Amino acid sequence: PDSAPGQAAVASAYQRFEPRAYLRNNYAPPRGDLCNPNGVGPWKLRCLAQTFATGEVSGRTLIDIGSGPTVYQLLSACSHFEDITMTDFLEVNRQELGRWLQEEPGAFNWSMYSQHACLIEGKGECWQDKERQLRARVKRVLPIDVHQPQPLGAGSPAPLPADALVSAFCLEAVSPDLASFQRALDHITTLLRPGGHLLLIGALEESWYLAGEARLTVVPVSEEEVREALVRSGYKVRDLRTYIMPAHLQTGVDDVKGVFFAWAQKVG
Amino acid sequence: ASAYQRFEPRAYLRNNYAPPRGDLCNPNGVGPWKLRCLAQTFATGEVSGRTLIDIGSGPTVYQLLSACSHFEDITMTDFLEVNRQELGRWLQEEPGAFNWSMYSQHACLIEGKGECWQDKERQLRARVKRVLPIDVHQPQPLGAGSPAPLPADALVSAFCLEAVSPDLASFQRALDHITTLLRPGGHLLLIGALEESWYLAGEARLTVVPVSEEEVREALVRSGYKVRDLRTYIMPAHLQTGVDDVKGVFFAWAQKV
Ligand SMILES: Nc1ncnc2c1ncn2[C@@H]1O[C@H](CSCC[C@H](N)C(=O)O)[C@@H](O)[C@H]1O
Ligand SMILES: Nc1ncnc2c1ncn2[C@@H]1O[C@H](CSCC[C@H](N)C(=O)O)[C@@H](O)[C@H]1O
Ligand SMILES: Oc1cccc(O)c1
Ligand SMILES: Oc1cccc(O)c1
């Protein structure tokens, strides 16, 4: 039938999305604890650092899809791309990012994440330098809607097509069903050049998460469903790993069972 | 040397461990060079045991960051009470403690074990059992009935001896004194100023004995050490700040025979 109904429920639910609560829920401890090497934060950072460390993912332009109020997903990326586009559906998230870009004190503090990224990249970089570079290389923060065939709109500011895409915890968190998820992946895929790379991180078998007042409906996906959608979109899957959420990190902020990381390269 | 009675801890930490000398971002600065010497030395695995004493800690902890994972019992020392108080403020996470986090981070970075800086800090705090008075001019620097386990398996001392000695001879004697504290076959990590004659600490102006790398070498030998490593950092111009006239910094790894 049609996609409007579910898409409309999603947009409606996000009107209540609270950036600070979401940051607290997922990026403050225990989930944001970077000392525990078995924690989810360290694993996410590690997937990104190792992928970029192959030297196989480079270019001039990078687009981060559904950045929300977070930047950790770009810490290892930023040394490999000189032009970075960050994006989100919600103005309030885009402002949160604005706060970090201006280095305001009222901003969320990512320095543990910056430090940790420096630590595992193994180049002796201080975190203030990593941050300075991320801030310099973010060239724009744009509204985005992945349900649109042109997710950035027509006549986008963004350099297109990009050399690479990053997207963490977006697609499954905004798609009422798997077919919607697939279409979203198809949409963002039009922004990536052939032979370009997508780094996709996401929730496994999740149906809801909390962001303050907002309780959001997530399509629960399996690793295998993630693989097939990537193939369906015209990628070769180069890496797909799974982290199983330990019980102690199951805090009632969501019903997440695990997290996936895909490295995929667009065929062409 | 009652000049040390006017010595202000915060002023000293300010002059030496805040920007520019305390910026650790640039790999060519003195802070990173110092941490590197300590890290690489312990990474060899040849310096180890159970107990370690830090001679003339002042109000600083950076010199034990790499050390702390190799020794379960650590003694810190200084001549000034005010310094011992400043140490205590950091060990006990009290208010207005100096912020060493940048240094903990850099040690974690250099060590390359994937360790978070908070774990590093917690372990150092855990292994420092006591902060004791000391005078290297005394034949028994720690006094007679010290709480400190002796003889130590290892010593560390940074910027103390030359900074408390009017001349080479006094420097040599003080080296003799601290050396009695070290078990035979033990290790000493000595860091110090090269060709320095004064530095400032608030109202205090201290006299320093200017020493050369050769003179440091010979002093260690004279004290019965085998010198396993002696390295020099030349002080770049941008780190010549008005707080002293230091020319360079030396790092020595020495073993008692
Ligand atoms: N239709 C849509 N198209 C693109 N992004 C959307 C969207 N609807 C909601 N979003 C955004 O999807 C995000 C999911 S939270 C993920 C945030 C971040 N990437 C991280 O790694 O933590 C929210 O920021 C939300 O505003
Ligand atoms: N007679 C003495 N015996 C032992 N230490 C002394 C001393 N007189 C002064 N000191 C201490 O020697 C220190 C020199 S500054 C100490 C340097 C510090 N450990 C660092 O690495 O930065 C001061 O803390 C001072 O209080
Ligand atoms: O970072 C996130 C976002 C949404 C669900 C989740 O389990 C984790
Ligand atoms: O850390 C120090 C201590 C004393 C003199 C100096 O130049 C540096």
Q: Is B161 helix (H, G, I), strand (E, B) or coil?
A: helix
Identify which of B251, B254, B255 has the alpha carbon closest to the alpha carbon of residue B31: B251
What does the alpha-carbon distance between residue A10 and residue A222 come to, in Å, rounded to a whole number? Answer: 21
How many residue contacts between A and B have a Cβ separation below 8 Å?
Answer: 28
A127 close contact with B: CB closer than 8 A: yes
CB B31 less than 6 A from any atom of ligand 2? no
Q: Enumerate residues 6+ apart whose C-beta is below 8 A from B209.
A: B162, B165, B166, B167, B168, B170, B171, B197
Identify which of B30, B34, B42, B22 has the alpha carbon closest to the alpha carbon of residue B100: B22
Measured from the Cβ of residue A106, the count of other Cβ atoms closer than 10 Å reads: 8
Overall CATH class of domain B1-257: alpha beta
Angle between helices B213-222 and B168-180 (to 10 degrees): 40
Q: Measured at the alpha carbon of residue B21, what is the angle toward residues A126 and A110, in degrees to the nearest 5?
A: 25
> Look-up: residue for tokens 């790499």?
B66
Q: If you measure from the C-alpha of residue A126 to the centroid of ligand 1, how many angstroms do you get, rounded to a whole number?
A: 29
Return the ligand 1 atom nearest residue A147 CA: 1
For residues B55 and B77, is the Cβ–Cβ distance under 8 A? yes
Rounded to a whole number of angstroms, the distance from the CA of B37 to the nearest CA of chain A is 15
Which of B24, B110, B116 lies at the smallest CB-CB distance from A35? Answer: B116
What does the alpha-carbon distance between residue A207 and residue A257 come to, in Å, rounded to a whole number? Answer: 10
Q: If you measure from the C-alpha of residue A229 to the centroid of ligand 3, how many angstroms do you get, rounded to a whole number?
A: 20
Cis amide bond preceding B95, omega within 30: no
Instruction: State the method.
Output: X-ray
The identity of residue B111, as a single letter, is E
Return the HEC string of A162-176.
EEEEEEECCHHHHCC
Rounded to a whole number of angstroms, the distance from the CA of A161 to the nearest CA of chain B is 35
CB A209 less than 6 A from any atom of ligand 3? yes
Count Cβ neighbours within 10 Å for each residue of A16-51 and write b for 16 or more, e otherwise: ebbbeebbbbbbeeebbbbbbeebbbbbbbbbbbbb
Chain centre to alpha carbon of residue A103: 21
- From residue B100, alpha-carbon distances to B23, B90, B97, B107, B199 in Å are 12, 9, 9, 11, 22
- Tell me the resolution in Å: 2.4
Return the ligand 3 atom nearest residue A245 CA: 7
Q: Enumerate residues 6+ apart whose C-beta is below 8 A from A236.
A: A264, A265, A267
A222 annotated binding-site participant: no
For residues A86 and A97, is the Cβ–Cβ distance under 8 A? yes
Measured from the Cβ of residue B3, the count of other Cβ atoms closer than 10 Å reads: 14
Give the closest ligand to the alpha carbon of residue A110.
Answer: 1
Identify which of B102, B4, B148 has the alpha carbon closest to the alpha carbon of residue A126: B102
A136 close contact with B: CB closer than 8 A: no
Whether A35 and B109 lie within 8 Å, measured CB to CB: no
Overall CATH class of domain A1-268: alpha beta
> Look-up: residue for tokens 């693989």?
A227
Mutating which of A34, A35, A128 best tests the B interface, going by the most B Cβ atoms within 10 A? A35
Nearest CA to ligand 1 atom 3: A145
